[PDB]
Design a protein around this ligand. Structure first.
Ligand SMILES: O=C(N[C@@H](Cc1ccccc1)C(=O)N1CC(C(=O)O)C1)c1cc2cc(Cl)ccc2[nH]1
Ligand SMILES: O=C(N[C@@H](Cc1ccccc1)C(=O)N1CC(C(=O)O)C1)c1cc2cc(Cl)ccc2[nH]1
Ligand SMILES: O=C(N[C@@H](Cc1ccccc1)C(=O)N1CC(C(=O)O)C1)c1cc2cc(Cl)ccc2[nH]1
Ligand SMILES: *Cc1c(COP(=O)(O)O)cnc(C)c1O
Ligand SMILES: *Cc1c(COP(=O)(O)O)cnc(C)c1O
Ligand SMILES: CC(=O)N[C@@H]1O[C@H](CO)[C@@H](O)[C@H](O)[C@H]1O
Ligand SMILES: CC(=O)N[C@@H]1O[C@H](CO)[C@@H](O)[C@H](O)[C@H]1O
Ligand SMILES: O=c1[nH]c(=O)c2[nH]c(=O)[nH]c2[nH]1
Ligand SMILES: O=c1[nH]c(=O)c2[nH]c(=O)[nH]c2[nH]1
Lengths: 793, 77, 793, 69
């Protein structure tokens, strides 16, 4: 692992592994040679780590999720193994540029957004905390689509991420497992049998998860679907049908699409995972009574809800345990995390679909529900409507299964991902269940890993911090509070601002080479990157942008703090409003960026193909972080945390974790604005009439009229009709209701920005208070209050 | 010398006998991986299908075709 | 047009047209036989094209220019007619080498540089776009002189280009016309008469202009002067005097020489052209009210300015139209292109000369001016100095006519040839006119034809591109942006670099057989070819060369990227500084090329007789394109565009079209350096003291002292005294002011060159962004915004 | 063709550097494909192209069974 030896290993791989010499090698070949050179460093500790779990049998944690938004692996691995500086030197001596090799790697974009990225941060924190934890998901052949912008509109291109090979994954043939679908059920005198099923094989692929500087390397096991081997041509081609189960990730963020294929993916990952878990338990040097003391399975949202009735199926139908005992061990095994409260995102599978595909699971679900309601009928004999409300089944016409209800009764703990969120989940949405079971509902505020989101993406900052207070903060982020000691340290504030500046220059180079636009390197980088959603409101942001443009058009010489406004994110393919909003933004940017009067005063960029590796670039270069969801809509958020950690100030609503960010850093140190949760409720009751604000606010009217009259789309004056219509008559995210307070807030931001010392002092107060948001703290609370597992430091 | 052919995912079927008759199974020979082949990504080429012929003054062109990429894999002999 | 038939036609022409057999035929005979074989293929479509214009009467465009820098015709014709491959085969089967036959053809060097080459590219684009366009010029018996280098100095030899015949031209006897000079004017009661004039006949010669693969063949009509037929010997000999009018092209690039013979050529081409245009209009199956809707005449610079008062003369004195109406139709007919802002290049003819030669035109010009000032006096009663500034007449001592002012008032549109240039023309130089008439001033960025400057000169590149994205780019160069898709395609980058290499080997062979020097085929080909000018600064380049030589002399073993520095171009015969700079370069090259210590590290070549056919050879072999004019001096440039299209990287200033090249390809993808327009202005105000830089920059001092002390001219130590003097005390192109930034830039170029993959990636980014620079796009904008004409695709 | 162009080798020498054996008629389409490339893309005249094509290809017949044709 020294420089001379890394060059030798690199040359060795280029030769024997890539079959090339320095004359014919491609950049991809060099990336692969380096990837293998680094990968070899994981082996020893990966084998030892998994071997140690078997010998000492610590209770294991299984994080079951349909998503793992991993981003790239090369750099992350080098950093957690302490190999980056040496590799950087080696590659440089070989006459190459490691950063260029790094760009060849495809993101493992096996997720949509926060839910999937939370899982990824969790694996890093769990390996860093030394827990015997495993991530279980699906090895999608195609991840979240690559986004292109054509004529101002989003276009989707398949993310063929495995086309050239994934050196970071390991096929595990010996652990293949069969998964069953369809068929029929038989209640024989030897137990109930699920027969005449269609079989799809699940081949597992393991990816190492290195902890930060601790010799621990855990595993991420992703399952891939394969047709079993018992017109000939057509029969062989049809093998594709089974293989389509793990073909592509469903691209919806916070939205439920009840497609049968999605249901197939859900049972696929759940069946393979649990059978693999039980297999390992049975081989452990451990009857099943100890199962719950040896296994904890965390449900990442309701997507893997079928795991509950699958575990019961295994215990009852296979292991021959009596229902009562099976049920007991089941509840003690599962814990569920609720990640959302938007109606349209709720998973409610029609009973008929479940009956056809998973007949044995439907039966078990009905039983679960029966024992569920019988107990309620007991405690509350009269309340008939209570039974209707707590039922796992919704019989209102098209009968369907309420997966969240199934997760609640089958789990011993249910948690939200931010205080305000967990409160609403416990006291509103699931009141009937929490009153019945107080101690079941918990909170576990989200977090982000400071390796990827600090050390990796912003080395200049990580280094500056380390020089002031040491490196202990990497593994204990609450150590950042020591930074408070430097609030009056002028030289340190200058050093802090220089790091932001350099990040800004570096990213301005990315922008200019990727887009036409000329970037004012000194302007304020106002950023909003996240999935496109009406509730996240990049639309509100767009109104503010148009507002700023008009102010410039009117008073061209007024002292204006220059800005580069960046907005990026993917829209789900079938989400019409989301796609219209993107087109609006690109249209606005085209006018702004090409109007001679504004020039270098204001530049607008719709950041294309926002994904993990691109978040690592833009976040460190950000001055103002846009976290403006309508109060009550963002369960927690985590992008908000990344910006805080990287030196940006936040303009947002009192929503999700924005509330706890305010508590930690001091509310005066964030630009909070708009309606809070109570204001939204009150405005609801009264009835929200969008027209009022439009008529009542002149700057807003001009904006609205311009969008509506074709100012931003001359060739198609009515192009934005749907946006206008939704805004006046169907906006449940009250865009106009926060417009005023939002714009007033934005002006205060510009005011502060003119005061570099005041601005950087507040930045320091944010960075110094960001410690709570490390996923290491989130995982400690999960380990202690839910999984009952302990580290190894 | 060079050999040029197609890298079939499934070769000639594996034959079994059921009740005295031949039965065919898919020859999934790449399932566990083939160490003997070497992907040559940099030499991928586009192949055209369908479309139509256009007879121009610039010279007859085949247009509006469907495209399929060809990824070569080299095996040493 | 198949191989067998071409051989037969070739043999037929060799026989009947050249009166030869294979035993006695010369190489010239073979060239001519092939030329005629190819020429016959144009006839059918030339007759049809001109016949179709008469029947359908589309509005015609007349491009009036004293210059048409056409280069050779054989290859260009074969390519645009799709005959090259077949002809190549035919000639090969006949046992000949088509490339050797091609070298026999003389360039039709009827131009000085960019202005003349722009006209030539325009004819190709207009025929390719299918416009009913005609080029009108002078059939000079001698074009731009052939340049020889003797004892390091430029020597001029007459370019007797017609000596052996021009198969590409067709005499058109039936269209001969008389042109009048001198004489006197009579204002009779039947109209004003221009009498007792000297008459010179204008015999027109038509050359076909084939469009690229479209059946269109337009016409270039060049006029030749002939003495009319009513001491006998002397009287017959004196017929030479009239014939001298079309004898030779004035060899000045960007410089006004007010010779009476030049004035004669100007009226000659204008009188013959307009009379021919009116004749055709009157014979058209069209009163004159429709004239402007049937005719558009573009003035290539002010050289054909007399066309304005000539058209009025024809309308008033001949066609008997009233002044008012004549004036209206005139403005609607003419459009003027301003190609320069250098003081010494401004055409200002002394009134006395115009009065003697063209008395009727002087009168008309005075009238034009009178109606011109009367209107200003009206709108601006007080501003007396405004009238002085906008007058067509300069009365300051030696009264002369400001031809640009005459072009402005007689035209409905005035355009510059590059954004920065058109801006300066509109807002500075002609502010008084643009404020008075905003919409009159336009921009039309120059372009080059991708047939001659890509398909023809670099078939290897045109083929490589076509294989990747098809042939559509030939007729729509903006299609080259698709090349962006291959930026990470290693094999494609290798293929791109191979094409450059082959071009380099081919040209290195040209160099070694033409000059002593041994060429390092792998060295970087650093090239600067264009007319020799103080403003173009090949002098700055020469300083950089001497600088590199000294670095080598000091540190012989320092890692140096080897270069072959090529500098070529003709100097106007009476331009002393230009001739001294050439002698400097040849002197420098002699030392460098023969110093044992540098050897193959650095070779210097002064490319002799730079002309169109030689540009086609050197441009494709270039790695680094020198476009280093002082900011504000090169209106546009087009050589810069040729290099970009052919795979060279550009080192230049933010001047002319270099600015738009940067916008299209991204500024980081060009080696921009030095003062921009504002820096030049500021340095002016402050006052430029050359001494400062000399004293302030050690590497520059050594260079300067060496030139000054005879190091580069031992036998005549003070030979370069004038260069030194101009440099310290009269350099208005601030050579020393950009020396530092220039040399720093050059080092960065060498740095990148060491990185073949990085270098070729930037090359690809240049080629992929060169689409805007096709003259097809320039012509579309001229057709749409000025001539109001439409194609035929 | 790409490998030929990259070699240190026009196309006149193509058949001297390239021999393609057609194993039965299955890859017969290679004959008109080479012509298509030579003619539509490389712009060579038909005659020249056809001559080069014949010198490049050699055909091996592996069966006379009618159902195999
Ligand atoms: O596949 C080889 N190396 C591997 C190396 C590799 C492995 C994992 C990820 C990236 C690269 C290879 O090039 N790829 C696997 C990918 C795929 O599955 O498409 C691409 C290999 C080396 C070698 C050497 C000889 Cl002599 C013969 C065959 C060979 N194959
Ligand atoms: O895939 C790895 N090795 C390869 C080795 C191999 C390569 C070619 C044929 C057979 C085996 C591997 O096991 N397979 C490629 C096959 C497939 O395409 O399914 C199966 C590998 C090694 C490794 C080491 C670490 Cl630390 C992490 C991930 C890793 N993957
Ligand atoms: O001039 C003839 N062919 C022409 C052919 C030609 C035409 C145009 C350009 C180049 C060549 C000829 O040789 N030249 C015209 C040039 C000139 O004007 O100097 C040179 C020609 C053929 C012929 C055959 C007989 Cl039998 C008698 C007289 C003849 N003259
Ligand atoms: C962190 C992250 C998210 C979640 O961001 P929010 O602003 O909390 O919605 C989404 N996408 C990517 C690529 C991320 O890295
Ligand atoms: C294109 C060209 C020019 C104009 O070149 P610049 O570098 O723009 O001055 C001059 N002479 C010849 C022979 C050309 O082909
Ligand atoms: C269904 C879903 O994707 N929910 C998302 O989950 C992440 C992680 O908990 C939250 O931060 C975010 O606010 C929320 O929108
Ligand atoms: C008077 C004259 O020859 N002007 C020249 O015209 C060409 C064509 O517009 C320009 O590219 C060039 O910069 C300029 O020097
Ligand atoms: O197909 C959709 N995907 C979503 O993510 C979404 N969200 C929404 O409101 N509608 C839709 N539609
Ligand atoms: O005779 C000249 N021709 C020119 O082109 C020129 N240019 C210049 O500056 N002086 C001269 N002189």
């Amino acid at each position: 692992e020294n420089v001379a030896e890394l060059k030798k290993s690199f040359n060795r791989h280029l030769h024997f592994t890539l079959v090339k010499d320095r004359n014919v090698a491609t950049t991809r070949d060099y990336y692969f040679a380096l990837a293998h050179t680094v990968r070899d460093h994981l082996v020893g500790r990966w084998i030892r780590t998994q071997q140690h779990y078997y010998d000492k049998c610590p209770k294991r944690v299984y994080y079951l999720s349909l998503e793992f938004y991993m981003g790239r692996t090369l750099q992350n691995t080098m950093i957690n193994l302490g190999l980056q500086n040496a590799c950087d030197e080696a590659i440089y001596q070989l006459g190459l540029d490691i950063e260029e090799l790094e760009e060849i790697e495809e993101d493992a974009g096996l997720g949509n957004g926060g839910l999937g990225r939370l899982a990824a941060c969790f694996l890093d924190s769990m390996a860093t905390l030394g827990l015997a934890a495993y991530g279980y998901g699906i090895r999608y052949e195609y991840g979240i689509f690559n986004q292109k912008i054509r004529d101002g509109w989003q276009v989707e291109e398949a993310d063929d991420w495995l086309r050239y090979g994934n050196p970071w994954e390991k096929s595990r043939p010996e652990f293949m497992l069969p998964v069953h679908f369809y068929g029929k059920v038989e209640h024989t005198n030897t137990g109930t049998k699920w027969i005449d099923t269609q079989v799809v094989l699940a081949l597992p692929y393991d990816t190492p998860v290195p902890g930060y500087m601790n010799n621990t390397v855990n595993t991420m096991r992703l399952w891939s679907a394969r047709a079993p081997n018992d017109d000939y041509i057509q029969a062989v081609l049809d093998r594709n049908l089974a293989e389509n189960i793990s073909r592509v990730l469903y691209p919806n963020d916070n939205f439920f699409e009840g497609k049968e294929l999605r249901l197939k993916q859900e049972y696929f990952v759940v069946a393979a995972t649990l059978q693999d878990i039980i297999r390992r338990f049975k081989a452990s040097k451990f009857v099943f009574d100890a199962f719950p003391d040896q296994v904890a399975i965390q449900l990442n949202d309701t997507h893997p809800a079928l795991a509950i009735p699958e575990l019961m199926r295994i215990f009852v139908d296979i292991e021959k345990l009596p229902w009562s005992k099976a049920w007991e061990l089941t509840q003690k095994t599962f814990a569920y995390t609720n990640h959302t409260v938007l109606p349209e995102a709720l998973e409610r599978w029609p009973v008929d679909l479940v009956e056809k595909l998973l007949p044995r699971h439907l039966e078990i679900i009905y039983e679960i529900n029966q024992k569920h309601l019988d107990r309620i009928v007991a405690l509350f004999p009269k309340d008939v409507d209570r039974l209707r409300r707590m039922s796992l089944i919704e019989e209102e016409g098209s009968k369907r299964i309420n997966m969240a209800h199934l997760c609640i009764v089958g789990s011993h703990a249910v948690n939200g991902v931010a205080k305000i969120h967990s409160d609403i989940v416990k006291t509103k949405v699931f009141k009937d269940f929490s009153e019945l079971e107080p101690d079941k509902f918990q909170n576990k505020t989200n977090g982000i890993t400071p390796r990827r989101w600090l050390l990796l993406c912003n080395p200049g900052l990580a280094e500056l911090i380390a020089e002031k207070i040491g490196e202990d903060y990497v593994k204990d982020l609450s150590q950042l509070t020591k930074l408070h000691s430097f609030l009056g340290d002028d030289v340190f504030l200058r050093e802090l601002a220089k790091v932001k500046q350099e990040n800004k220059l570096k990213f301005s180079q990315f922008l200019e080479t990727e887009y036409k636009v000329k970037i004012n390197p000194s302007s304020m980088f106002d950023v909003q990157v996240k999935r496109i959603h009406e509730y996240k409101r990049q639309l509100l942001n767009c109104l503010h942008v148009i507002t700023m443009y008009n102010r410039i058009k009117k008073d061209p010489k007024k002292l204006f703090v220059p800005r580069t406004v960046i907005i990026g994110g993917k829209a789900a393919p079938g989400y019409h409003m989301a796609k219209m909003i993107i087109k609006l933004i690109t249209s606005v940017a085209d006018v702004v960026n090409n109007d001679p009067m504004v020039g270098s005063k204001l530049k607008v960029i719709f950041l294309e193909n926002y994904r993990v590796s691109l978040a690592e670039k833009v976040i460190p270069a950000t001055d103002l972080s846009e976290q403006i969801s309508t109060a009550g809509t963002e369960a927690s958020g985590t992008g908000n945390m990344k910006f805080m950690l990287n030196g940006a100030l936040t303009i947002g609503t009192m929503d999700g974790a924005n509330v706890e960010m305010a508590e930690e850093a001091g509310e005066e140190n964030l630009f909070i604005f708009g309606m809070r949760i109570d204001d939204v409720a009150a405005l609801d009751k009264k009835g929200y009439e969008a027209k009022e604000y439009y008529e009542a606010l002149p700057e807003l009217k001009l904006v609205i009229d311009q969008i509506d009259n074709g100012f931003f789309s001359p060739k198609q004056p009515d192009l934005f009709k749907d946006i206008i219509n939704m805004l006046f008559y169907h906006d449940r995210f009250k865009v106009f209701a926060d417009y005023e307070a939002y714009v007033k807030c934005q002006d205060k931001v510009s005011q502060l920005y003119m005061n570099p010392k005041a601005w950087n002092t507040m930045v320091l107060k944010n960075i110094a208070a960001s410690g709570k948001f490390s996923s290491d703290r989130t995982i400690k609370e999960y380990a202690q209050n839910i999984w009952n597992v302990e580290p190894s430091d």
